[PDB]
Protein backbone atom coordinates (compact mmCIF):
# COMPACT_ATOMS: atom_id res chain seq x y z
CA UNK A 853 0.00 0.00 0.00
CA UNK A 854 0.94 3.62 0.46
CA UNK A 855 3.54 3.36 3.20
CA UNK A 856 4.57 1.66 6.45
CA UNK A 857 1.39 2.57 8.37
CA UNK A 858 -0.72 0.56 5.89
CA UNK A 859 -1.31 -2.95 7.33
CA UNK A 860 -2.35 -5.93 5.22
CA UNK A 861 -1.93 -9.69 5.69
CA UNK A 862 -0.68 -10.98 2.33
CA UNK A 863 -0.98 -14.65 3.38
CA UNK A 864 -4.67 -14.77 2.51
CA UNK A 865 -4.52 -13.01 -0.86
CA UNK A 866 -6.49 -14.17 -3.88
CA UNK A 867 -4.38 -16.59 -5.90
CA UNK A 868 -2.08 -17.41 -3.01
CA UNK A 869 0.22 -15.85 -0.46
CA UNK A 870 1.81 -12.60 -1.62
CA UNK A 871 -0.17 -12.52 -4.89
CA UNK A 872 -1.85 -9.33 -6.04
CA UNK A 873 -3.58 -7.32 -8.68
CA UNK A 874 -3.37 -3.98 -6.84
CA UNK A 875 -1.14 -2.19 -4.35
CA UNK A 876 -3.82 -2.39 -1.60
CA UNK A 877 -3.17 -6.17 -1.41
CA UNK A 878 0.44 -5.59 -0.34
CA UNK A 879 1.58 -4.82 3.21
CA UNK A 880 3.05 -1.47 4.19
CA UNK A 881 5.06 0.23 1.45
CA UNK A 882 5.00 -2.88 -0.83
CA UNK A 883 3.48 -2.62 -4.28
CA UNK A 884 2.14 -5.02 -6.89
CA UNK A 885 4.59 -6.24 -9.54
CA UNK A 886 3.94 -6.84 -13.21
CA UNK A 887 3.94 -10.59 -12.46
CA UNK A 888 1.29 -10.28 -9.78
CA UNK A 889 3.47 -10.58 -6.68
CA UNK A 890 3.90 -8.04 -3.93
CA UNK A 891 7.36 -6.48 -3.94
CA UNK A 892 9.47 -4.15 -1.81
CA UNK A 893 9.89 -3.71 1.93
CA UNK A 894 6.76 -3.25 4.02
CA UNK A 895 8.43 -1.23 6.80
CA UNK A 896 11.64 -1.05 8.84
CA UNK A 897 11.63 -2.43 11.52
CA UNK A 898 9.00 -5.12 10.85
CA UNK A 899 7.11 -5.62 13.04
CA UNK A 900 7.05 -1.93 13.90
CA UNK A 901 7.13 -0.54 17.47
CA UNK A 902 3.71 0.11 19.03
CA UNK A 903 2.10 2.90 17.04
CA UNK A 904 0.76 3.32 13.51
CA UNK A 905 3.23 0.85 11.94
CA UNK A 906 2.37 -1.98 14.35
CA UNK A 907 0.23 -4.61 12.56
CA UNK A 908 -1.85 -7.04 14.63
CA UNK A 909 -4.99 -9.03 13.78
CA UNK A 910 -7.15 -8.72 16.88
CA UNK A 911 -9.78 -11.13 15.53
CA UNK A 912 -7.47 -14.03 16.45
CA UNK A 913 -6.73 -12.99 20.02
CA UNK A 914 -6.63 -15.81 22.55
CA UNK A 915 -9.11 -14.16 24.87
CA UNK A 916 -11.56 -13.68 21.93
CA UNK A 917 -11.90 -11.07 19.11
CA UNK A 918 -10.59 -7.69 20.26
CA UNK A 919 -9.85 -8.99 23.80
CA UNK A 920 -6.47 -8.42 25.41
CA UNK A 921 -4.32 -8.71 28.48
CA UNK A 922 -1.55 -6.49 27.04
CA UNK A 923 -1.29 -3.76 24.45
CA UNK A 924 0.83 -5.87 22.06
CA UNK A 925 -2.39 -7.82 21.37
CA UNK A 926 -3.93 -4.61 19.96
CA UNK A 927 -3.51 -3.25 16.45
CA UNK A 928 -1.47 -0.13 15.74
CA UNK A 929 -1.61 2.51 18.46
CA UNK A 930 -4.51 0.74 20.28
CA UNK A 931 -4.00 -0.20 23.91
CA UNK A 932 -5.61 -2.58 26.38
CA UNK A 933 -8.46 -1.18 28.49
CA UNK A 934 -8.92 -1.98 32.18
CA UNK A 935 -11.78 -4.26 31.07
CA UNK A 936 -9.55 -6.23 28.69
CA UNK A 937 -10.65 -4.81 25.32
CA UNK A 938 -8.42 -3.21 22.70
CA UNK A 939 -9.24 0.49 22.47
CA UNK A 940 -8.55 3.70 20.55
CA UNK A 941 -7.63 4.19 16.91
CA UNK A 942 -5.01 1.94 15.32
CA UNK A 943 -3.77 4.91 13.27
CA UNK A 944 -3.25 2.93 10.04
CA UNK A 945 -3.49 4.41 6.57
CA UNK A 946 -6.71 3.53 4.70
CA UNK A 947 -4.72 2.58 1.59
Ligand SMILES: [Cl-]
Nearest residue numbers: 855856857858
Ligand atom coordinates in the same frame (compact mmCIF):
# COMPACT_ATOMS: atom_id res chain seq x y z
CL1 LIG B 1 2.36 5.38 5.78
Ligand SMILES: [Cl-]
Nearest residue numbers: 865866867868
Ligand atom coordinates in the same frame (compact mmCIF):
# COMPACT_ATOMS: atom_id res chain seq x y z
CL1 LIG C 1 -7.45 -18.36 -4.56
Ligand SMILES: [Cl-]
Nearest residue numbers: 900901902903
Ligand atom coordinates in the same frame (compact mmCIF):
# COMPACT_ATOMS: atom_id res chain seq x y z
CL1 LIG D 1 7.10 -0.86 21.24
